[PDB]
Amino acid sequence: SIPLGVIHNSALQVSDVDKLVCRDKLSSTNQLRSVGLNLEGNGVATDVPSATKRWGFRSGVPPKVVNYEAGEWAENCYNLEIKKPDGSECLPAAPDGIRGFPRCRYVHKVSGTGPCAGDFAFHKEGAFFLYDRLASTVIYRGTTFAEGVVAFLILPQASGYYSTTIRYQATGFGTNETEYLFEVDNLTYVQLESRFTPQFLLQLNETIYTSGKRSNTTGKLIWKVNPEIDTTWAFWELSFTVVXXXXXXX
Amino acid sequence: SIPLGVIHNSALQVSDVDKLVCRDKLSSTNQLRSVGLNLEGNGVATDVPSATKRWGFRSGVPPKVVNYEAGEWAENCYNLEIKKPDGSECLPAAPDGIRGFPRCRYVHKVSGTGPCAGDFAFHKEGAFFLYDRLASTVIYRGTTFAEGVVAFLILPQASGYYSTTIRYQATGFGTNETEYLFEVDNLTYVQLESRFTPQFLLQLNETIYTSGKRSNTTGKLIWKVNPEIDTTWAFWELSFTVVXXXXXXX
Amino acid sequence: SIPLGVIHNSALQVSDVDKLVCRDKLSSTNQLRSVGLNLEGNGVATDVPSATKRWGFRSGVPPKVVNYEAGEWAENCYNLEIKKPDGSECLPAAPDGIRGFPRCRYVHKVSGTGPCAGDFAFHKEGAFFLYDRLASTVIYRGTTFAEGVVAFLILPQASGYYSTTIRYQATGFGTNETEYLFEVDNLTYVQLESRFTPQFLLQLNETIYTSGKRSNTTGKLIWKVNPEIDTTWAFWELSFTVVXXXXXXX
Amino acid sequence: EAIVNAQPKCNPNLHYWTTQDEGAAIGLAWIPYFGPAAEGIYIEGLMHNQDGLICGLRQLANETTQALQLFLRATTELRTFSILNRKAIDFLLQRWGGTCHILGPDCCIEPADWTKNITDKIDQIIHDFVD
Amino acid sequence: EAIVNAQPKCNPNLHYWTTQDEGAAIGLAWIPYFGPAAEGIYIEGLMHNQDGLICGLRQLANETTQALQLFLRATTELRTFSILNRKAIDFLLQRWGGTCHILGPDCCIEPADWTKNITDKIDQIIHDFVD
Amino acid sequence: EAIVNAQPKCNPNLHYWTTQDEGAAIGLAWIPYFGPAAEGIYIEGLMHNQDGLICGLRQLANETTQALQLFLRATTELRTFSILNRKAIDFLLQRWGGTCHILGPDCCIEPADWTKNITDKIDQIIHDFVD
Numbered sequence A, B, C: 001s002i003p004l005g006v007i008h009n010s011a012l013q014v015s016d017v018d019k020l021v022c023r024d025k026l027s028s029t030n031q032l033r034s035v036g037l038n039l040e041g042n043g044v045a046t047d048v049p050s051a052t053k054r055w056g057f058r059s060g061v062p063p064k065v066v067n068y069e070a071g072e073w074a075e076n077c078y079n080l081e082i083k084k085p086d087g088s089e090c091l092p093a094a095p096d097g098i099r100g101f102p103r104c105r106y107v108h109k110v111s112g113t114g115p116c117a118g119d120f121a122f123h124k125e126g127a128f129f130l131y132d133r134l135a136s137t138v139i140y141r142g143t144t145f146a147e148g149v150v151a152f153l154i155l156p157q158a159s160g161y162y163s164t165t166i167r168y169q170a171t172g173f174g175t176n177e178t179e180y181l182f183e184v185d186n187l188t189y190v191q192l193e194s195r196f197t198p199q200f201l202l203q204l205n206e207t208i209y210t211s212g213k214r215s216n217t218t219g220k221l222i223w224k225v226n227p228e229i230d231t232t233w234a235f236w237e238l239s240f241t242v243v244x245x246x247x248x249x250x
Numbered sequence D, E, F: 001e002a003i004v005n006a007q008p009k010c011n012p013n014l015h016y017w018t019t020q021d022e023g024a025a026i027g028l029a030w031i032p033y034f035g036p037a038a039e040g041i042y043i044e045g046l047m048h049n050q051d052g053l054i055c056g057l058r059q060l061a062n063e064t065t066q067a068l069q070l071f072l073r074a075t076t077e078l079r080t081f082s083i084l085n086r087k088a089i090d091f092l093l094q095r096w097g098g099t100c101h102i103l104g105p106d107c108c109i110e111p112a113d114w115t116k117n118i119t120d121k122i123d124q125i126i127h128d129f130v131d
């Protein structure tokens, strides 16, 4: 039986299917609610290297979609454009009527390649991919989602929105040896580490632009940050030298 | 709250969500009905020039469909085949299971071109496009519809069908300067005015055929009716001289 | 009104819509069930020649699908790949989410040609084509189904699976003069008769392989069984000489 | 609320079409293979403006539109079929969604016949009292 | 109505398959990524013809077909999932869709235990009457 | 059962978004042609952890997942919209799916006010007894 949340004795409880409480009152279907909660709020790591390891490809399992009426503003959302090395798409197009998650402070847009050894990409921990009031078991191509879970409630009787896209390139997506690059421009990249926060990437991107450290040839410039540099606990609580042109920031 | 019609004191009323009437009886879902009513029956102008000005194109709004169980026989229905000047379709194909409105005395089939500055065509006054027991917010290509609205009822406890297609050509569809031509044959046309009724168009078409006033070259013959000629209040209550060959009927 | 089965006086009955029985109890939607029953269990002939005559093509009727929660293990299921003589498909692809019937001892896979004088293939006796927990009024291409019907129940308060595919070729499918061939290999065939059971076809296939009676040229070898040979009432209760190479088994 | 037709005109007669979910079929016409095509499943009827119901209904459908459009804007379902079933559920929840306090304004239980049973059995106890 | 099996034969045993909406999952098998594929979600059972239920059920499904086909002909929904929910609603509306007149044939309220409370408190008033 | 948050962390504040099914529209904003696009239909709110409801809700959604995933595995519907309506039906069937035995633990009928009517009319029969 799908649990149903109810408020008793100033506390949230799961309603017991066996015992009937006559003083509980449901005078309208408006008292019933489906809600989506982000894994973010439970303290999971939200960096792209950590987040993508929670997803995997699998065949033989039909995708399933369930609706939810209200959700939570997300700090981190994800948007995937993954192909196989042969150029074929790894993810299906978003079905009719499935739009991106509506509130994302940072959209981590990952483009790249991987083996993609399965028809659909699922959440390895059984969570859902939250879209616009539709929760799916699988990832759709180029469609912004937040990781999350769904609850059902019976309620008692009755800064704007800013979003910033952070672009990544990836190889070996969905495996042990996945490599990630933060994208400054089409020719300037930064080797990605799991400890980099969104705010650090955007500031590192700004200094690279204003220090003039972009590629000024036709070749690819890949910067690397050495461990010395720190980065800035949950979200709610420099010298450049050049050594495909690799380089170091210290 | 969506209003629900109920019969009290020998009159139709909207049921009040706040006040409970215990002597009201709903013993079966069969007592509940969804019905479609045609804008026609409220006295709106049904001529193609007037009707098409009530529709417009708009992007960013997903289309929505709601079902209804019973409808009203329509005098006027519409069927649109509009392309952009570059040849691309302005309207989407009818989704699976959406058929034309089932009772239309006259089907005004309009083919032509316009800018179509939007992904979908909506009703500017918020009405619906009524199809076969499905009401949509948007127009589907080549699919016969009637303009209408939907009501919901809780009821108390328990000439054949002729249809005639009238064909039009249009330019500048959906703008200030839309031009319309009634189609006699593929080369003979009549300049359309809003005052022309369906019965007048069919009789004017018959006289043109029997007076032999069709095009007998390979060129396009466009007749014009001068204001002198009248036309025949709601639906329920000649000399030809030639001056692309334009001409006059008086 | 759709009948609803209920158990009264140690017997199954159709619940009467008119008379209300207050001692009948429905404490949960779990007590309500939709179930699919196979025509097989009523004693109908299951051989391909007899089964296919119960289906026919028809235009103008939209297909309809209804779900059912539980079904019956089938001895005989069918899977059709029928084209017109011009190569175009006679049956539509299976819609999204419609999979084959999940329990079939024998899958009779019929490939071939016929006139297919209609948009969809229906059951001439009004039965359904049972798929994976979805019952359709029409046949989908290359999708395994069992013939069956659906019942609805209100219940009182609370060997593995082997499947064998048998392949046939057909001409004139869906007509008076349909010819069927059982497929031993791509070049060896047996003229099909309605009296042949699945077990007989599989044993006849095995003897043909072990007696070495397959085609050993590039041409098509079509065996025929003469009436002398019997075949082995419902399911729950040799000398080869050669005379396109036709031949005889006696 | 009452219904006030505020339309430029009203067609007072309703020439309507609908289907039939259990029409007494003749022979094999219920079989999809043999039955009518999509165009031939309709029945027709004609209803007049007795009690002003037709002109009230035209106004009701007009007034329903704002709420229906706002409902459709907020749903993610591509085609909505559940409005009438949900109104039936809300009908039941309004009456039976809580404890039914007998003789209350929101409890639709009539004990009258059983008042005329309990008060009609006092003269089996107060009558039978001979000693 | 009663069910009269009028079929040429009846398989008296029901070897059935179905799913499970809350099977006690072992470990991580409930996770779609780790769980069974489409072919491995079924449970099986075997039921015999006690009380003639199997042969009655085969006839019931046969007799249901005309009404079900006519319902499907009249719906515009491509796939119908709502039949059982609507029958549950109609079950409730048949009993609770109007005022429940106590002791009436259509009101499923049993006051017996509270008859044996009101009549069982007369000997707190007629007994206690000493003066 | 009680809700025990066993998560590594809990964001105690809920910055939420949702829609409105009957927002008091200004002018013509309810018309799809004139109204907001898909991105502009949302309202926002902020809720704090009074009574520990936010951290309980995060744990509830987490614990709901196994049952919801098993339900979705067993349904053939591509998109499920009916969970809340079915819970409303089951709410009613649990209380009104059988005969309501007054004063029983499973019958939500309160006769108290009508006890204080029947017992309050004994002094219209035992009082009026003068001879």
Ligand SMILES: *[C@@H]1O[C@H](CO)[C@@H](O[C@@H]2O[C@H](CO)[C@@H](O[C@@H]3O[C@H](CO[C@H]4O[C@H](CO)[C@@H](O)[C@H](O)[C@@H]4O)[C@@H](O)[C@H](O)[C@@H]3O)[C@H](O)[C@H]2NC(C)=O)[C@H](O)[C@H]1NC(C)=O
Pocket: A042, A124, A125, A126, A127, A149, F006, F007, F008, F062, F063, F065
């Ligand atoms: C609901 O909330 C639960 C509690 O937060 C979530 O539990 C998580 O469940 C997953 C399994 O799906 C666990 O992942 C496993 O982790 C182990 C251990 O990983 C490493 O970490 C420990 C220290 O934490 C270390 O000691 C070990 O040596 C490992 O190096 C792996 O071995 C497994 O392969 C698997 O990845 C999570 O660890 C677990 N989290 C917690 C906090 O217990 C549950 O997923 C939530 N449900 C949903 C649907 O989101």
Ligand SMILES: *[C@@H]1O[C@H](CO)[C@@H](O[C@@H]2O[C@H](CO)[C@@H](O[C@@H]3O[C@H](CO[C@H]4O[C@H](CO)[C@@H](O)[C@H](O)[C@@H]4O)[C@@H](O)[C@H](O)[C@@H]3O)[C@H](O)[C@H]2NC(C)=O)[C@H](O)[C@H]1NC(C)=O
Pocket: B042, B124, B125, B126, B127, B149, D006, D007, D008, D062, D063, D065
């Ligand atoms: C429900 O019924 C209502 C009453 O019939 C419908 O009301 C209609 O609402 C639309 C707006 O969506 C109005 O259209 C506007 O009309 C004004 C005025 O247009 C010209 O006409 C007047 C004389 O009638 C003239 O004096 C003016 O100078 C104008 O030349 C325009 O300026 C607006 O831009 C807009 O087009 C209708 O006029 C109005 N009809 C009536 C009879 O009041 C309502 O639409 C119905 N709802 C649905 C969903 O169908």
Ligand SMILES: *[C@@H]1O[C@H](CO)[C@@H](O[C@@H]2O[C@H](CO)[C@@H](O[C@@H]3O[C@H](CO[C@H]4O[C@H](CO)[C@@H](O)[C@H](O)[C@@H]4O)[C@@H](O)[C@H](O)[C@@H]3O)[C@H](O)[C@H]2NC(C)=O)[C@H](O)[C@H]1NC(C)=O
Pocket: C042, C124, C125, C126, C127, C149, E006, E007, E008, E062, E063, E065
């Ligand atoms: C529910 O169960 C019913 C009883 O089993 C099923 O009744 C079947 O209905 C179909 C019509 O759709 C009948 O088919 C017709 O059969 C006649 C006669 O065919 C030949 O057979 C008799 C001897 O049986 C012979 O005497 C005749 O001369 C014929 O040579 C044909 O003429 C018709 O054209 C048509 O094909 C079945 O015969 C009938 N079966 C039985 C046992 O009565 C019903 O179909 C079931 N419903 C569903 C939905 O499955």
Ligand SMILES: CC(C)COC[C@@H](CN(Cc1ccccc1)c1ccccc1)N1CCCC1
Pocket: A005, A012, A033, A034, A035, A036, A069, A070, A071, A072, A153, A155, F014, F016, F017, F018, F045, F047, F053, F054, F057
């Ligand atoms: C258990 C408690 C959280 C009580 O819910 C408290 C809150 C519900 N909403 C907000 C909401 C509003 C409309 C429809 C659905 C949900 C909520 C939003 C997102 C996630 C979870 C809940 N109410 C509603 C508003 C203010 C109160």
Ligand SMILES: CC(C)COC[C@@H](CN(Cc1ccccc1)c1ccccc1)N1CCCC1
Pocket: B005, B012, B033, B034, B035, B036, B069, B070, B071, B072, B153, B155, D014, D016, D017, D018, D045, D047, D053, D054, D057
């Ligand atoms: C408020 C009054 C109009 C009472 O409805 C009066 C009428 C309902 N139908 C006709 C109808 C029939 C079946 C299902 C739904 C509707 C109706 C048809 C089209 C538009 C509006 C209504 N009944 C029914 C028939 C005869 C009586």
Ligand SMILES: CC(C)COC[C@@H](CN(Cc1ccccc1)c1ccccc1)N1CCCC1
Pocket: C005, C012, C033, C034, C035, C036, C069, C070, C071, C072, C153, C155, E014, E016, E017, E018, E045, E047, E053, E054, E057
């Ligand atoms: C009328 C009798 C057949 C009573 O149904 C008896 C049986 C129902 N199932 C099996 C079943 C199980 C779960 C959900 C739906 C159906 C059944 C299966 C296939 C076809 C028909 C029925 N119950 C259930 C099990 C054991 C008992």
Ligand SMILES: *[C@@H]1O[C@H](CO)[C@@H](O)[C@H](O)[C@H]1NC(C)=O
Pocket: A176, A177
């Ligand atoms: C991935 O790398 C790990 C070690 O980090 C190794 O154990 C595993 O075998 C590798 N996977 C494959 C497919 O080689």
Ligand SMILES: *[C@@H]1O[C@H](CO)[C@@H](O)[C@H](O)[C@H]1NC(C)=O
Pocket: A186
């Ligand atoms: C960067 O590359 C992307 C992808 O090829 C392309 O769409 C975009 O126009 C490029 N931008 C510039 C500034 O070259």
Ligand SMILES: *[C@@H]1O[C@H](CO)[C@@H](O)[C@H](O)[C@H]1NC(C)=O
Pocket: A164, A165, A166, A167, A202, A205, A206, A209
């Ligand atoms: C990186 O910095 C440049 C310079 O201001 C800016 O234009 C660009 O948008 C930044 N990139 C991101 C992802 O914010």
Ligand SMILES: *[C@@H]1O[C@H](CO)[C@@H](O)[C@H](O)[C@H]1NC(C)=O
Pocket: A211, A212, A213, A214, A215, A216, A242
């Ligand atoms: C030119 O390129 C070098 C590295 O190739 C870079 O560090 C420098 O910023 C560029 N241009 C400037 C400083 O104008």
Ligand SMILES: *[C@@H]1O[C@H](CO)[C@@H](O)[C@H](O)[C@H]1NC(C)=O
Pocket: B176, B177
């Ligand atoms: C359309 O014509 C009207 C005058 O009839 C004018 O006011 C309006 O600007 C025109 N529209 C455009 C887009 O030019």
Ligand SMILES: *[C@@H]1O[C@H](CO)[C@@H](O)[C@H](O)[C@H]1NC(C)=O
Pocket: B186
């Ligand atoms: C008229 O033109 C239409 C559209 O091109 C075409 O389909 C039709 O066959 C033509 N009819 C005649 C008589 O030429």
Ligand SMILES: *[C@@H]1O[C@H](CO)[C@@H](O)[C@H](O)[C@H]1NC(C)=O
Pocket: B164, B165, B166, B167, B202, B205, B206, B209
């Ligand atoms: C116009 O008249 C001709 C001649 O009778 C007829 O064939 C044709 O169908 C008419 N057109 C319409 C639209 O009725």
Ligand SMILES: *[C@@H]1O[C@H](CO)[C@@H](O)[C@H](O)[C@H]1NC(C)=O
Pocket: B211, B212, B213, B214, B215, B216, B242
């Ligand atoms: C020939 O064409 C003229 C106009 O070009 C037309 O009016 C006339 O009817 C046609 N033919 C006749 C009269 O036979």
Ligand SMILES: *[C@@H]1O[C@H](CO)[C@@H](O)[C@H](O)[C@H]1NC(C)=O
Pocket: C176, C177
């Ligand atoms: C099919 O054959 C039968 C005789 O077996 C005959 O009556 C019927 O006419 C034939 N059908 C056609 C289309 O020729």
Ligand SMILES: *[C@@H]1O[C@H](CO)[C@@H](O)[C@H](O)[C@H]1NC(C)=O
Pocket: C186
């Ligand atoms: C037999 O023919 C089928 C269909 O053309 C083909 O798929 C299969 O590979 C063939 N098998 C052999 C053994 O040639």
